[PDB]
Design a protein around this ligand. Structure first.
Ligand code: CLA
Ligand code: CLA
Ligand code: CLA
Ligand code: CLA
Ligand code: CLA
Ligand code: CLA
Ligand code: CLA
Ligand code: CLA
Ligand code: LHG
Ligand code: PQN
Ligand code: SF4
Ligand code: SF4
Ligand code: SF4
Lengths: 68, 141, 739, 73, 73, 49, 80, 138, 39
């Protein structure tokens, strides 16, 4: 996986499960979830009445399916 | 068939009501032309015209003609909105254009709805009408 | 004292196309559909878009000007409808047989049936506002004068729009201009209320008194002189009133006794029209004018005389309140929300006082003739007053969470208010429970004893009796007033306390309102519901900052749904949710108030007086024995008097039947938002979103469900809308069916 | 008798679905129930929930529309 | 007159069924709360976070469909 | 001349020393009801209540 | 007492440990993220269940979970 | 528990009988400057010069007080200690349990309450049937 | 002036213009041909 790559989420937990997202970074420091995938769609986050959630999550390498 | 309903021409109750139909418009003959219009319908003992929604073509104007008319001028609304929403999803800010409607594009799409059933069968045979089950986001299952 | 900033904001169209420019959380763009609701809910929260106290004041000033433009547009609409689309030219000739109608309906789908025969050949909706009685009292004679008033109002609305644009965009006043509240109340008392009352006293002396005295004499409106013909030739006014031959030289020398010809403290009601005399009405406005102009020279201003509010407040300290009010002037001059709380409380109580006085002392000619106008006006102003009192509670809570810092006020009245919130809410809980047990429990006891066949055990007037002895004593004092405790009052203040049944045109204008045990029980229900509304709103105001449950409500805000499911569940701890519950309780309280009024006037006041002198009432004295059980309210009031609103189909009153059913629908619909929660609707919207995604029509603006506060707000809005529309239809169809 | 048994029937049907939900929470094993009819109930729940949404909205819009139309005219 | 009330009855049956199966199938979790099996059947809510989560449990779908059952009957 | 102090000189207990709750007459009267009177056996205070 | 569990998806953003009113949570060192810290819940018998920690968590779905359970005096917030 | 109490006039919001039957909480902070703070019980008080000792009935009230001591004062008071005192007499020490506030990593704390999985790999209630446990704690 | 263009193009103004247009054509069709229960 590299920057700018479109990937499909298979987390089974995430709001963007089955949704596509541009990869924003890959981390090499040996962490559990090193790939920062950022989406057009915002999730369910924040207090009630908040106008938006967050469009970013950290996914592992195995969860992503490359579609580009 | 349909012995329970007599046509409103040979009905006592409907004649009793049609002596006193009101005027719905400024025109003073609106009640008379309405009584002449409903005389060809089927009405029960109450004297009010009933509609027949079997699809029998002797009563096709009761339901099937408004059925076709609504389906056309609502598939118009659905297809136009779908085509506009699909179009604005490649403009680098698809969310603001739902707020401020791009009216040249909107009017072009709205006058694109003459040929929606042909566009519908075209997009269904070419696969743009639906999406695959895996390609769409979904809940945990 | 006038210092302004010139052209503080350019007048440009560019911010119009970018919604949400005002709030920094919306200036990014709409990610979800919650952005729309936030765009509307934060549009007038001027105190949260910025925190300068100067620009919010300029925003408030120009918003007031735009609102006055709206009010003048509405008032121009009223006068234009009375000018063109009305039978005012016909009703003025015969205001005892034909009825007002200021709205004709275009016939499109058969709604020309709403153009019912209102009288004189005119066809249209019979109006229930007292606009025609207002214009008869103010001296209108022809439709051209109403047309001129409508055109002048539209011009004044354009002037208010221009003034709002002027005072935001080219010359906006500074903060020190707004904090001159002593000069402000000098001008609002002396110049707004005082000179307004003086100008209206002058109008009533010179227009209302001649036109209405000749119309009482029996002169046709076509033969009525135009109101300036009584000014250009004062000889005509000398023909009518003999005290105008002496001029103003009795006034300036304090020979005021010769003005008793028309400035009289007569009291009572005019027998030929049913309204108040405009003699004591003009005298009343003159006295109010003098008193207000005198009171407008109280507070200190540029000159050394006057009486500064700060020292007045600091002078008032006792042993119980400690440091006293020294701290309150900085509260009300640095916070628009405390000002809005006090002004909303007093405007709501004033609207309720207006409602309670304009039935018992009907100030307009022929207002007490028709019961549609009286019932509609009482009901309308009760609803407006209750809404404004709930707003007072709301902005008390907003002030406590937002504009109240305890650094600048230690041990003053507001601090000591907050230091014993448990005692206040405790004793108000006790009085609410006490009155709810002893006001509704008497109704349940009567209802059970009537069901059990024990009518001697009931709380009737022919049973265990609960007489309102203090209100009966006060009625006795006001009947015995115009001889001893008001010597120069010829008649009683109103006939509601006692006296003679005033019958004009065969219908009862005003007759004494007797208070039996039914009135005792209903008034204690009134006290109970008013106390519970005060409990909810006062609890919101006191507990807005912090409670024992959530000690940090102040920084969670004002509109927050909950703190979470913990501590058992803190589901409605905000002050906003206390407003939300006080809206339901205000609806309950005012609906009981207007049901009490409608039934008491239908059974004990309104009716037809026969020429033999006997009075027969609209529901024939039901209230004495039926208004003590709940079954009597459900059977003799709601079931019996809705026969006029549900049998109204196929007639002119069929719009009220439609509106009756519509109000029921909106009530039942509101229960969807009130009873449900956000979670169900979000996971249902997700399945609908899936159905859109399957065929590529999913929106880019993500459809969130309504938020928790949004769901509660729309539930209470539809609840009050449905209930008020149902009661509006019920009252305005009962009343047009009784005369 | 009619109203009594129809109310009991409504209560029992709502309880049947309540215990369907309690089964899906507690006693449902998605490993043993792999690709059978229950797993495929849960594997397309959005489709049939959206179609119940459509049919209830459709039918409600037009029953209230016909009732309000008859009522207004 | 029986046509419209049968369609109202069908509307009530379909909407009660919609709420009941929306509690039955979403008892294991939707995107608002992907774990509801661990909170159980009748937990109150999940906090004011995630937008607000007031009646998300399957027990609350029982609750709403109880209202709709009473209406339909 | 303050008449509302804190209860018993403790400013953090949830009570005020108001002229009704903690006056001299209230102390001598509430504190001399049978439920609070000193030295009585429970039988006589229950009998008087 | 309620149990506050922190999962592997924590990014050490500290938002939960300062959103908590009762300061049940605290940050401990960790080797599984860039921030080199993970939230822990040591004094979890003081958790009232307010779920302001879940509200402040940015990771999706949730790196911190509150599981409401056996109520006590501390976990019900009773001043009496 | 050293410290003179704040100059507070007393209030009805405060210590009920829970304080003298079970635990009540004391917050102790030291400030150089005398100023005015909002007690979470309702009202406003006077911060004494030097040490203060405020007795409250809930831990949330003590932490809310400490929060407003931290954020609402420009000379931030961060040396505030929250105790839990029992009517039997012994005093516990609660909020700055280690040296530093919980937001900062002390590097000597222990990761408890941490699961070795995400929520997706949480066990499901059908496996743990009649086990006396619940799907988180397995 | 591009601001009035972008304000007349907003969702509420355009939806109210659209609803007013559809209401106008429906009302005019009811004004000319009043009572059409069927074909
Ligand atoms: C034009 C866009 C668009 C189109 C093509 C669809 C199409 C679909 N919707 Mg709908 N829907 C939309 C807008 C759209 N919807 C909006 C705006 C709402 C919010 C109220 C919804 C909410 C909604 C619900 C709640 C459900 C559907 C469902 C459905 C399906 C059945 C048709 C139906 O029930 O209509 C119903 C339509 C409505 C209730 C509202 C329609 C609103 C207007 C009339 C549509 C046009 C919107 C906009 C003005 C177009 C822009 C024009 C352009 C020039 C800018 C179908 C896949 C159903 C489903 O699940 O299918 C299985 C269902 O349950 N929709
Ligand atoms: C005697 C002089 C005079 C008079 C007649 C007015 C009259 C008014 N003022 Mg003003 N005011 C004055 C001097 C005066 N003010 C002074 C000296 C101060 C300076 C401190 C202000 C500060 C001030 C503010 C800050 C506000 C008002 C507002 C108002 C309006 C009250 C709205 C209302 O209740 O409906 C009664 C309305 C009328 C009777 C309409 C009469 C209008 C014509 C032009 C007179 C009204 C137009 C409020 C308002 O609506 O602003 C627009 C408001 O926001 N005034
Ligand atoms: C505040 C409004 C106001 C206004 C503008 C007027 C204006 C008028 N009054 Mg006045 N008047 C008013 C209030 C008012 N009055 C009140 C409150 C009283 C009761 C004390 C009267 C009692 C009154 C008398 C008794 C007379 C006037 C008359 C006049 C006219 C001549 C006055 C003059 O030139 O000096 C003038 C049209 C005189 C008149 O009618 O001549 C045209 C006259 O004889 N006035
Ligand atoms: C003198 C009048 C006065 C003034 C000017 C204010 C001003 C304000 N109030 Mg308000 N308020 C008042 C009266 C007043 N209020 C009354 C009488 C109530 C009691 C109900 C309240 C209750 C109250 C609450 C509870 C809140 C405010 C808030 C606000 C602020 C923002 C309002 C906003 O953005 O709404 C924008 C406008 C709307 C959202 C429109 C609402 C739609 C209405 C309710 C329904 C439709 C009404 C209509 C008659 C029905 C016909 C429509 C349809 C059928 C066709 C602002 C400071 C808010 C605030 O500051 O909190 C931070 C807040 O939350 N107000
Ligand atoms: C008919 C419906 C109903 C009834 C009975 C109540 C009852 C009450 N509400 Mg209310 N409420 C209602 C609907 C109702 N509400 C709704 C729709 C809402 C809108 C959201 C609210 C919102 C609400 C709030 C926000 C508040 C209340 C409060 C109160 C209490 C006021 C105290 C009182 O009246 O004394 C008690 C009187 C009664 C319960 C009615 C008389 C019944 C008889 C006398 C008692 C029965 C006799 C006997 C004991 C039966 C025993 C039989 C044996 C077999 C056991 C009371 C418990 C207020 C409160 O708690 O004040 C302290 C409060 O703050 N209400
Ligand atoms: C054959 C009939 C039957 C059986 C044996 C069960 C048995 C069960 N149900 Mg129930 N249920 C049924 C019918 C049935 N139900 C029906 C018809 C409904 C629809 C109304 C439901 C709706 C339902 C819900 C939504 C819930 C259950 C749950 C429960 C479980 C606990 C029972 C409980 O908490 O009650 C203990 C007793 C009470 C709570 C008393 C309240 C009952 C009424 C108000 C009092 C009546 C008493 C009066 C004297 C008669 C248990 C396994 C609960 C559970 O946790 O499942 C695991 C759960 O949340 N049930
Ligand atoms: C008069 C009362 C009323 C009305 C009309 C609605 C209407 C509806 N409910 Mg219901 N509901 C109500 C009371 C009401 N409910 C109450 C009190 C509760 C108990 C808590 C619920 C709980 C609830 C649940 C839990 C659910 C609904 C759903 C819905 C939809 C059902 C589909 C339908 O009937 O076609 C639509 C028919 C209508 C009559 C819609 C009303 C709109 C009218 C026509 C005017 C619209 C035009 C314009 C906006 C103005 C619809 C929006 C279900 C849903 O959304 O499925 C998609 C859903 O799951 N309801
Ligand atoms: C959603 C259901 C729906 C349906 C199927 C229709 C269908 C129709 N209505 Mg109707 N109507 C509806 C709801 C609906 N209405 C509502 C909710 C109301 C209340 C606002 C009306 C009030 C209404 C009037 C008052 C009239 C119609 C008429 C019409 C007829 C022709 C309309 C036209 O322009 O040609 C047609 C049979 C017109 C007609 O000719 O009826 C026979 C007519 O005069 N309708
Ligand atoms: C009133 C008694 C009253 O006026 O007391 C007088 C007292 C005023 O205290 P001071 O004498 O300190 O007054 C100084 C004030 O002038 C401060 O401006 O008010 C209070 O202490 C409030 C007590 C509320 C007492 C309970 C009131 C609750 C309403 C009861 C309604 C009963 C009918
Ligand atoms: C139905 C419902 C929803 C779903 C509501 C949604 C999705 C809003 C739908 C609004 C539609 C789009 C209509 C918007 C307003 C209309 C234009 C108003 C028409 C009124 C005219 C007659 C004046 C919630 O989100 C919710 C949240 C919290 C508690 C209860 C509920 C709740 O009951
Ligand atoms: S989210 Fe809803 S149910 Fe949960 S605590 Fe808040 S208001 Fe109550
Ligand atoms: S808020 Fe969530 S992501 Fe941030 S430190 Fe706490 S558990 Fe980790
Ligand atoms: S539930 Fe509340 S008190 Fe408990 S750990 Fe989370 S934020 Fe802290």
């Amino acid at each position: 996986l590299n920057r700018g790559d479109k990937v499909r989420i298979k987390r089974t937990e995430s709001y963007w499960y089955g949704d596509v997202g541009t990869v924003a970074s890959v981390e090499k420091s040996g962490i559990l979830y090193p790939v920062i995938v950022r989406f057009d769609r915002v999730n369910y986050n924040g207090f009630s009445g908040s106008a938006s959630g967050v469009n970013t999550n950290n996914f592992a390498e195995n969860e992503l399916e490359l579609v580009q | 068939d349909f012995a329970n309903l007599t046509p409103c021409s040979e009905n006592p109750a409907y004649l009793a009501k049609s002596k006193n139909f009101l005027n719905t418009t400024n025109d003073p003959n609106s009640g008379k032309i309405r009584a002449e219009r409903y005389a060809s319908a089927l009405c029960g003992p109450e004297g009010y015209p009933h509609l027949i929604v079997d699809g029998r073509f002797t009563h096709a104007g009761d339901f099937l003609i408004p059925s076709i008319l609504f389906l056309y001028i609502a598939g118009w609304i659905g297809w136009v909105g779908r085509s506009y929403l699909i179009e604005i999803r490649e403009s680098k800010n698809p969310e603001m254009q739902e707020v401020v409607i791009n009216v040249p594009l909107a009017i072009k799409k709205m006058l694109g709805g003459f040929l929606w059933p042909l566009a519908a069968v075209g997009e269904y045979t070419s696969g743009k009408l639906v999406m695959k089950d895996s390609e769409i986001p979904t809940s945990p299952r | 004292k006038v210092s302004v900033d010139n052209n503080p904001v350019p007048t440009s169209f560019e911010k119009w196309g970018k919604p949400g420019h005002f709030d920094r959380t919306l200036a990014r763009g709409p990610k979800t559909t919650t952005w729309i609701w936030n765009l509307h809910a934060n549009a007038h929260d001027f105190d949260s878009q910025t925190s300068d106290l100067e620009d919010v004041s300029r925003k408030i000033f120009s918003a007031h000007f735009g609102h006055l433009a709206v009010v003048f547009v509405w008032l121009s609409g009223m006068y234009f409808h009375g000018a063109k689309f009305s039978n005012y030219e016909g009703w003025l000739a015969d205001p005892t047989h034909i009825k007002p109608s200021a709205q004709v309906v275009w016939p499109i789908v058969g709604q020309g049936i709403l153009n019912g025969d209102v009288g004189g050949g005119f066809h249209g909706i019979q109006i229930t506002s007292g606009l025609f009685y207002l214009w008869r009292a103010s001296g209108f004679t022809d439709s051209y004068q109403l047309y001129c008033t409508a055109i002048g109002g539209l011009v004044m609305a354009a002037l208010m729009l221009f003034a709002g644009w002027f005072h935001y965009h080219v010359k906006a006043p500074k903060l020190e201009w707004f904090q001159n509240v002593e000069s402000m109340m000098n001008h609002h008392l002396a110049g707004l209320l005082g000179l307004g009352s003086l100008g209206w006293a002058g109008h009533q002396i010179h227009v209302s008194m001649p036109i209405n005295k000749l119309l009482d004499a029996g002169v046709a409106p076509k033969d009525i002189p135009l109101p300036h013909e009584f000014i250009l030739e004062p000889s005509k006014m000398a023909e009518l009133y003999p005290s105008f031959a002496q001029g103003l030289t009795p006034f300036f020398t304090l020979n005021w006794g010769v003005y008793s010809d028309f400035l009289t403290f007569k009291g009572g009601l005019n027998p030929v029209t049913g309204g108040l005399w405009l003699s004591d009405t003009a005298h009343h406005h003159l006295a109010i004018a003098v008193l207000f102009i005198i009171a407008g020279h109280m507070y200190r201003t540029n000159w050394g005389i006057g009486h500064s509010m700060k020292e007045i407040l600091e002078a008032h300290k006792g042993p119980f309140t400690g440091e006293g009010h020294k701290g309150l002037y900085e509260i009300l001059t640095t916070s628009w929300h405390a000002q809005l709380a006090i002004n909303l409380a007093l405007l709501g109580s004033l609207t309720i006082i207006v409602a309670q006085h304009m039935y018992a002392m009907p100030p307009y000619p022929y207002q007490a003739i028709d019961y549609a106008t009286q019932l509609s006006l009482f009901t309308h102003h009760m609803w407006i007053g209750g809404f404004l009192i709930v707003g007072a509670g709301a902005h008390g809570a907003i002030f406590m969470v937002r504009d109240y810092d305890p650094a600048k006020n230690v041990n003053n009245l507001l601090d000591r208010m907050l230091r014993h919130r448990d005692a206040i809410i405790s004793h108000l809980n006790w009085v609410c429970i006490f009155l709810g047990f002893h006001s509704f429990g008497l109704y349940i006891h009567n209802d059970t004893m009537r069901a059990l066949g024990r009518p001697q055990d009931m709380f009737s007037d022919t049973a265990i009796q609960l007489q309102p002895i203090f209100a009966q004593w006060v009625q006795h004092l006001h009947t015995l007033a115009p001889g001893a405790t008001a010597p120069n009052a010829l008649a009683t203040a109103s006939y509601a306390f006692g006296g003679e049944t005033i019958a004009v045109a065969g219908k009862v204008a005003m007759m004494p309102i007797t208070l039996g045990t039914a009135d005792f029980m209903v008034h204690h229900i009134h006290a109970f519901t008013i106390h519970v509304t005060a409990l909810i709103l006062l609890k919101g105001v006191l507990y807005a900052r912090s409670s024992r449950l959530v000690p940090d409500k102040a920084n969670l805000g004002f509109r927050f749904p909950c703190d979470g499911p913990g501590r058992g569940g803190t589901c409605q701890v905000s002050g906003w949710d206390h407003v939300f519950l006080g809206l339901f309780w205000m609806y309950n309280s005012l609906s009981i108030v207007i049901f009490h009024f409608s039934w008491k006037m239908q059974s004990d006041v309104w009716g037809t007086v026969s020429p033999d002198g006997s009075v027969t009432h609209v529901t024939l004295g039901n209230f004495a024995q039926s208004a003590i059980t709940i079954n009597g309210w459900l059977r003799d009031f709601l079931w019996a008097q809705a026969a006029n609103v549900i049998n109204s189909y196929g007639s002119a009153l069929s719009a009220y039947g439609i509106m009756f059913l519509a109000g029921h629908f909106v009530f039942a619909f509101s229960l969807m938002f009130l009873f449900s929660g956000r979670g169900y609707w979000q996971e249902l919207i997700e399945s609908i979103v899936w159905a859109h995604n399957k065929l590529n029509v999913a929106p880019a603006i993500q459809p969130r469900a309504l938020s928790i506060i949004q769901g509660r707000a729309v539930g209470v809005a539809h609840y009050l809308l449905g209930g008020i529309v149902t009661t509006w239809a019920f009252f305005l169809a009962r009343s047009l069916s009784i005369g | 008798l009619y109203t009594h048994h129809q109310y009991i029937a409504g209560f029992l049907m709502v309880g049947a679905f309540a215990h369907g939900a309690i089964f899906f929470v507690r006693d449902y094993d998605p490993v043993a129930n792999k690709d059978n009819v229950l797993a495929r109930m849960l594997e397309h729940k959005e489709a049939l929930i959206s179609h119940l949404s459509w049919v209830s909205l459709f039918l409600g819009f037009h029953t209230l529309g016909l009732y309000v139309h008859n009522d207004v005219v | 007159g029986d046509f419209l009330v049968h369609h109202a009855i069908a509307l009530g049956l379909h909407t009660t069924a919609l709420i009941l199966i929306k509690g039955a199938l979403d008892a294991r979790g939707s995107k608002l709360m992907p774990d509801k099996k661990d909170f159980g059947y009748s937990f109150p809510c999940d906090g004011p976070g995630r937008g607000g989560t007031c009646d998300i449990s399957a027990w609350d779908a029982f609750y709403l469909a109880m209202f709709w059952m009473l209406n339909t009957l | 001349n303050q008449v509302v102090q804190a209860y018993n000189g403790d400013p953090f207990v949830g009570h005020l020393s108001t002229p009704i709750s903690d006056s001299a007459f209230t102390r001598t009267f509430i504190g001399n009801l049978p439920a609070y009177r000193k030295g009585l056996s429970p039988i006589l205070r229950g009998l008087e209540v | 007492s309620h149990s506050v569990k922190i999962y592997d998806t924590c990014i050490g953003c500290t938002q939960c440990v300062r959103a908590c009113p009762l300061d049940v949570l605290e940050m401990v060192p960790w080797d599984g993220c860039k921030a080199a810290q993970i939230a822990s819940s040591p004094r979890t018998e003081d958790c009232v269940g307010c779920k302001r920690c879940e509200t402040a968590c940015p990771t999706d779905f949730l790196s911190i979970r509150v599981y409401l359970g056996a109520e006590t005096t501390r976990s019900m917030g009773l001043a009496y | 528990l050293s410290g003179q109490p704040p100059k507070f006039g007393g209030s009805t919001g405060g210590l009920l009988s829970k304080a003298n039957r079970e635990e009540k909480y004391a917050i102790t902070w030291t400030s150089a400057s005398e100023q005015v703070f909002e007690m979470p019980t309702g009202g406003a008080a006077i911060m004494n010069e030097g040490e203060n000792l405020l007795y409250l009935a809930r831990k949330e009230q003590c932490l809310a007080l400490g929060t407003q001591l931290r954020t609402k004062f420009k000379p931030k008071i961060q040396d505030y200690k929250i105790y839990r005192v029992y009517p039997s007499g012994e005093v516990q020490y609660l909020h700055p349990a280690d040296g530093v506030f919980p937001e900062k990593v002390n590097e000597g704390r222990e990761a408890q309450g941490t699961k070795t999985r995400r929520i997706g790999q949480n066990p499901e209630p059908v496996t743990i049937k009649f086990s006396g446990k619940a799907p988180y704690e397995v | 002036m591009d601001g009035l263009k972008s304000f007349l193009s907003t969702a509420p103004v355009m939806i109210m213009a659209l609803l007013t247009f559809t209401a106008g054509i429906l009302i005019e069709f009811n004004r000319f041909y009043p009572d059409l229960l069927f074909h």
